Design a protein around this ligand. Structure first.
Ligand SMILES: OC[C@@H]1O[C@@H](O)[C@H](O)[C@H]1O
Ligand SMILES: OC[C@@H]1O[C@@H](O)[C@H](O)[C@H]1O
Ligand SMILES: OC[C@@H]1O[C@@H](O)[C@H](O)[C@H]1O
Lengths: 491, 139, 491
């Protein structure tokens, strides 16, 4: 009983926008402070205050876009508190957490330039003013003379920055103001009016979209505000248990494995149904769907502060990431950005740090393996896959194929069963020449296999050779609980 | 304005003329040398009524309320004291007061129903000081 | 410059419900009287009062479903007027048109049995009562004792008939009561409640849907009445000129050719957008979309009564029909019935009669050539086609492929350009064996080529041989202004 797949290598169905592989960093826990920002005089080796070990790993992963500063923090942030001389930045210290605002606009834009990624900034609607947000944009982007542009120059950046992605509030249905969609849509329309295109900059204005299955939100924002947006967001976290006892990152049950993956795959139905509503108001698909919060959310590691959201990261997280990325690919006609929550030390991170030490999570390795899909052409594939899990409720395999700019084909495959391997037969159609293939696979011997600071390489990619290629068929034996990428070269 | 009215912040146009806000776009210069005092003088020289449009789209309720108070109040307050420091001892009279302009478009892309609510809110705080009587105009 | 197509012969995309090839006959002009019903002692040869020449032609075409009695007539009809001793039924005559009610329920049900087609009756909401409609269903379908079933037996039909398709009013936004969607939805819910399933009969209840681009109607009916319907209708006529001067059926300009075809192809946008709204409320596509009025609508033939809607029928009509049917195929995941307006002597008919004489229109020949698509499996095809018309506004070629129950493949092609032939290269993938092909084509030497009673065979199907099949490519040279079907057999 093999899964079967046919790849039509000559039929392109869309472009997988690189920003599908995006990231998110809030001022929360150790995502910004320690995770990225250590300060110029830290003994952790750093580039202008940003730790080198993280920088180098994120560059290798080819981070395309980074969303900052929030999350809920964005609708509480007053950007002027984060610019100017470090010693006059606003300082808050709670003894029950330090926000010293040493990382602000200039440090973020420096971060993005060091990474080679797009900045994606969210302005403050819930507790901010229209002038405040307008002034932020002007500060960043205006090349003339004004109090804001002159301030930016004073603070060390002479020429403006370019920025496309601009979020007009975040989570406005909840921590960003507990707003009705109808009320948010009016604020949105008002705020966005004053966010200008200065110089040769072109803003890509993103309205706050729904939480999970709040389809009414999407309908209202589309019906009332479509002509005034370039994108609409969507938030959906994979939470295995109930809110008050989400379940652990490691040491979990087999039931928790299956439930986690089933909940992750619910993304497909969400994206489908929100997109269907968007199609009614925007049939040409002008407006991007932006899934700017996704990923797993567990109970924090025992003994850690629940407010810091620190969780471990296992092969289970790798499967969530790979299957979710595949869902985004299948919707790349409308989904054009996604941002996993969150970059470092918080929720489903690519990196965890502990002082000067760091590790790469299994989530990191999926992003780094799947980077070959960034800006690739999605190929037409059809499939008939085995089932797995209790009552066959899950697909055993998730597969996606794309063509890179040099003509190579990448086929990525997830085996969602932790107990046995998956046989897959792939037929390749529409090739001219012959092809050869190499592979890499990410797997584990344990259902909760993970990396630690003492053992940072327990779960990492390896060469994959358990396949054969002949007569236009590639037959592969995928390991249990694995993510695999095959690279095909023509000739 | 026009569209400028829902972008203007009136405080930028008062005070020592030399130290007012400057903006320049290469791609147009606004030095704010013509502001509230200069406009009110202009209307007095012409013998015409002044008709000012306050900023709803990017302005705040306090900001508009303070504009009216600055112009018209004859007592002691931070705004009236500031007007006197800026060279006008007694208040001016003004009737015609626009509570935003072009709010369906360049003044905030507002639905009528939403503008009506902001209108009701903003106008509440535009007071009749001394013997002045405002004539409030909705967009 | 060939159009190119690839057929994936092993990939099925859906089932083309046979009812896509449906028809519609209203009590209007000579559609029912003379067109079908001649009376038992007419010198026109007949079977139980229905003319044999039409019967035989419709059976050969494999008519799958016939909608009666309207149109606007349905929301004026009182069915009890059409049952009982034929001689004593209601008579109306307008001098300023005769309705003797000799064709009523028994005659219609007999007609469908003789044809082997499903009956599709529209009940009267606009001027009818809930009891009246409920009694109609009971009269037709109930096998016990009751006043209605006893009456049917007295009128000569002992056992009940079966009927699936039941329209709960027609054109209720216009001639069926000038209703707002919200008000119609409420009447719909009320009327349908009383339409019972008697014996082993199962009704398929159809709500009146939108006229043309009235998307609000579809939204309201889906949101308020989806759980109470099996199907929702849609109406769209191709009208070349303005309402008051639509343009003629023959002797038209080349501009009228292009405008006609462009307007016809607007069906795709309509069906797409109405279907998108349906998907929001019915994501599993339970509810059928029924396009129960479509076709061309011209000024009547000079000197004929405008109220009788008699128009000629040319190769231009054949192209409208073939391109429209192809649009329905591409939407066969949701469109499950369609009904061209109207069957005989009215609008875009398959047959025109003049006393005992009859002719087959070019529209007939499309339906008869495309019957091979009835209940077939739609195959995955992709294409890149030449453009035609002023400014390349039209596709030069429309193509569709399906697989019949015996494994043959039919590929139909329309060439929309009247000026030159169309080269097409078709690649066949996913076959095992070799294949051979035969073809038929329908074309004319004039842009308004048509059949007349004196020359009833000027435009009719002919063998098509101008193609070659080698090395899994079928290259064809389609004639100008043509509709062609290729039949492929494996081995
Ligand atoms: O502050 C914790 C918040 O909870 C979640 O809804 C958000 O993603 C995060 O900003
Ligand atoms: O400012 C440009 C604007 O165009 C028009 O809508 C307004 O009057 C004017 O202020
Ligand atoms: O009856 C005349 C009407 O015109 C169209 O609206 C309807 O199909 C037809 O019944």
């Amino acid at each position: 009983v093999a899964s079967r797949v046919v790849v039509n290598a000559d039929r392109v169905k869309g472009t997988i926008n690189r920003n599908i592989y995006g990231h998110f960093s809030e001022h929360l826990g150790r995502c910004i402070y320690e995770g990225l920002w250590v300060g110029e005089d830290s003994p952790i080796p750093n580039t202008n205050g940003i730790r080198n070990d993280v920088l180098e790993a994120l560059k290798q992963m080819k981070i395309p876009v980074l969303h900052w500063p929030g999350g809920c923090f964005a609708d509480e942030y007053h950007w002027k508190d984060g610019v100017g001389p470090r010693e006059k930045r606003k300082r808050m210290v709670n003894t029950h957490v330090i926000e010293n605002n040493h990382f602000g606009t200039h440090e973020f834009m420096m971060l993005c330039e060091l990474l080679g990624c797009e900045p994606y900034i969210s302005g403050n609607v819930g507790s901010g003013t229209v002038q405040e947000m307008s002034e932020w944009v002007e500060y960043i982007t205006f090349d003339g003379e004004s109090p804001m542009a002159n301030w930016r120059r004073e603070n060390g950046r002479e020429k403006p920055w370019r920025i496309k992605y601009w979020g007009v509030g975040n989570e406005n249905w909840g921590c960003g103001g507990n707003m009705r969609a109808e009320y948010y849509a009016d604020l949105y329309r008002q705020f966005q009016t004053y966010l200008r295109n200065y110089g040769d900059n072109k803003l890509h204005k993103i309205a706050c979209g729904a939480n999970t299955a709040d389809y009414h939100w999407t309908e209202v924002l589309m019906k009332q505000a479509a002509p005034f947006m370039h994108g609409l967001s969507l938030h959906y976290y994979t939470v295995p248990g109930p809110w008050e006892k989400k379940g652990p990152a490691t040491g979990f049950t087999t039931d928790e494995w299956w439930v986690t993956l089933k909940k992750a795959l619910f993304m497909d139905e969400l994206v489908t149904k929100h997109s269907a509503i968007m199609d009614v108001y925007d049939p040409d698909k002008r407006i991007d769907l932006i899934v700017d919060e996704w990923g797993t959310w567990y109970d924090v590691e025992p003994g850690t502060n629940p407010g810091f959201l620190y969780q471990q990261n296992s092969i289970r997280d790798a499967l969530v990431a790979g299957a979710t990325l595949h869902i985004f690919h299948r919707h790349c006609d409308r989904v054009r950005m996604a941002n996993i929550a969150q970059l470092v030390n918080v929720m489903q991170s690519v990196i965890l740090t502990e002082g000067e030490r760091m590790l790469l999570t299994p989530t990191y390795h999926v992003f780094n393996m799947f980077k070959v899909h960034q800006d690739a052409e999605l190929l037409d594939t059809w499939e008939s896959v085995e089932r797995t899990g209790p009552e066959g409720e899950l697909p055993k395999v998730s597969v996606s194929a794309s063509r890179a700019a040099d003509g190579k084909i990448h086929i990525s495959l997830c085996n969602l069963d932790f107990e046995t391997g998956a046989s897959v037969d792939i037929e390749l159609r529409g090739l001219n020449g012959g092809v050869s293939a190499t592979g890499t696979t990410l797997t584990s011997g344990r259902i909760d296999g993970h990396n630690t600071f003492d053992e940072p390489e327990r779960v990492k990619p390896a060469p994959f050779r358990d396949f054969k290629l002949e007569g236009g068929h590639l037959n592969a034996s995928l390991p249990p609980m694995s993510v695999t990428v095959l690279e095909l070269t023509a000739g």
